[PDB]
């Protein structure tokens, strides 16, 4: 119960510019934890936004690059951290990909509009504050019929 | 004398923001060779800003992180470049840290106010555009007896 404060803000540089995200640790301990420890680890560093949606998300956190990889930070995959004062009800919340129920591991998107069919299936643990800009320029890149960017766009390093 | 055209913009990305820089290459075509191509292979990721004096210039672009490594892309030191046309006339000045003539390898440093007594020993090869606050930021943080910052400062990644 003595500890350190989660992060609660990251600045994630990509290819096409920075995204500044603001952090639910309070409602999402192991969500942040596991995000925020990747990120000053350098897990997420050259990692594409492999999966791009126009009109819906851009996802990116996988290391091998196609939606099968990633980790959490405990080695297994973890649980779902569902608050109903966290909704998909705007663009640009920040939340867990996944594959069903309590199968977090490292991906994670962003939504460039309000998707509330996600609600109470996919972990809502931050939202972008400043950059959005950079979230609709990596949302309408040119992509291939797997929703897989031509140019790579990348994470280069979120800090904090 | 068929060849491709030498980047002339970069974007390097940092723990405090983003440095927006263009360059030289008709007049430095070696200088901008060896900086765009360590830039495009990702050399410079997670390089310190080493040694930052405030009023003076922050460099970086060591691997060693210390001012004692780094290497051209063709393995030897390569040769100055000088133009009277390219001055370290204005502050936020891009140029070629070194140890005496024809001893460029990778390090560079970017000035914060002019500094004329570097003309013709230092390779001036571009200059900052945007993020001339950034440049200021990293140029004031607190550094030991050595200028060496107390807290990290990275190259994350130069983009083009
Ligand atoms: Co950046
Ligand atoms: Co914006
Ligand atoms: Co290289």
Same mark, same amino acid.
């Given at each position: 119960?003595?500890? #350190?404060? =989660? ?6 540089? !990509?290819?096409? *510019?920075?995204?500044?995200?603001? =952090?639910?640790?309070?409602?999402? $301990? ?7 420890? /990747?990120?000053? +680890? ?7 936004? /492999? ?8 996802? #990116?956190?996988?290391?091998? @690059? %196609? *939606?099968?990889? @990633?980790?959490?930070?405990? @080695? ?24 069903? $129920?309590? !199968? +977090? ?10 998707? $509330? ?8 643990? *931050? ?5 959005? %800009? &950079?979230?609709? *320029? ?5 992509? %291939? ?11 280069? +390093?979120? #800090? &904090?």
């Amino acid at each position: 119960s003595a500890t #350190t404060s =989660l992060p609660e803000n990251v600045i994630m540089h !990509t290819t096409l *510019g920075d995204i500044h995200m603001k =952090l639910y640790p309070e409602e999402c $301990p192991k969500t942040v934890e596991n995000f925020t420890t /990747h990120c000053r +680890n350098g897990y997420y560093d050259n990692h594409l936004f /492999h999966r791009v949606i126009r009109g819906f998300m851009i996802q #990116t956190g996988d290391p091998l @690059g %196609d *939606g099968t990889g @990633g980790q959490s930070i405990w @080695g297994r995959e973890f649980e779902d951290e569902f608050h109903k004062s966290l909704r998909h009800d705007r663009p640009f919340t920040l939340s867990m990909a996944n594959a069903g $129920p309590n !199968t +977090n591991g490292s991906q994670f998107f962003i939504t460039t509009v309000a998707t $509330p069919w996600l609600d109470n299936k996919h972990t809502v643990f *931050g939202r972008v504050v400043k950059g959005m %800009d &950079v979230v609709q *320029g990596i949302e309408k890149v040119k992509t %291939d019929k797997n929703d897989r960017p031509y140019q790579d766009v990348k994470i280069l +390093n979120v #800090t &904090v």
